[PDB]
Amino acid sequence: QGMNIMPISESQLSDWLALRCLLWPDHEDVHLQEMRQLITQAHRLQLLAYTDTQQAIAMLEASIRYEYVNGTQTSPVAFLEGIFVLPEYRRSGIATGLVQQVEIWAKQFACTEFASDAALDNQISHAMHQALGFHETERVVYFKKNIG
């Protein structure tokens, strides 16, 4: 009679896409191509939260990382790839419940650290991360060049 978290199945790709496009606006086929791979992967977790009326109101994606993640001292570590809750549902703390499901899952992979990141100019994401129990570790500038 409230909210409910579940790992995403192929049957729920549309509900996943609808929220995923709000988080990361992009071409539908790019999303779907990625979504279909992720659900076959053991090192990936993707969840949806539903209401009574079967409305998908939140999603989370996470991974297990074996390469060095900034701010960490162990490997592997869990990593938050994306989380999105509809505004009307933020005060419900379903985001806390989603995060907690990753930790149970990450514990299976012998992880003791759960990392994430956010754009430097997105302070709201910084406030959200702290509200979920994350603390800041490092601020980083990324560079790259083409290899000719």
Place this chain on the structure above:
Amino acid sequence: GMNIMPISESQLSDWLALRCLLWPDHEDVHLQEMRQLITQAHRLQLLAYTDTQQAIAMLEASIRYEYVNGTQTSPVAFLEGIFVLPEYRRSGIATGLVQQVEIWAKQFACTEFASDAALDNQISHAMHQALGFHETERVVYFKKNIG
């Protein structure tokens, strides 16, 4: 006539000495990390030597198969670290060290060469530009404990 060479198991001394300046830590920690690196196919570590066979620069790099911020390809080469003695920077040995990674990376089927730096290390940012890198993203990292 500076010479750039991959680091052998008998050059830990020169490597350690430059590696300690770049990342101050304790010797036995460095050393056992260094010994592991040498055997790894996805890793490259170089030293630059002068005429007098004085070690004046070092570089470490890796191939990354997991997502690196700012890139759109996988895998990518990644600059793990680079140090040139202050006195030898004006010689552009850092440039010659980067080039050796690219050749190595090309031959690993990479097309992008990524790196990062602490936000408060503007000198590194100036150095990355000097080496031909351009900025892709600025990012804050977070963490919480599980067990």
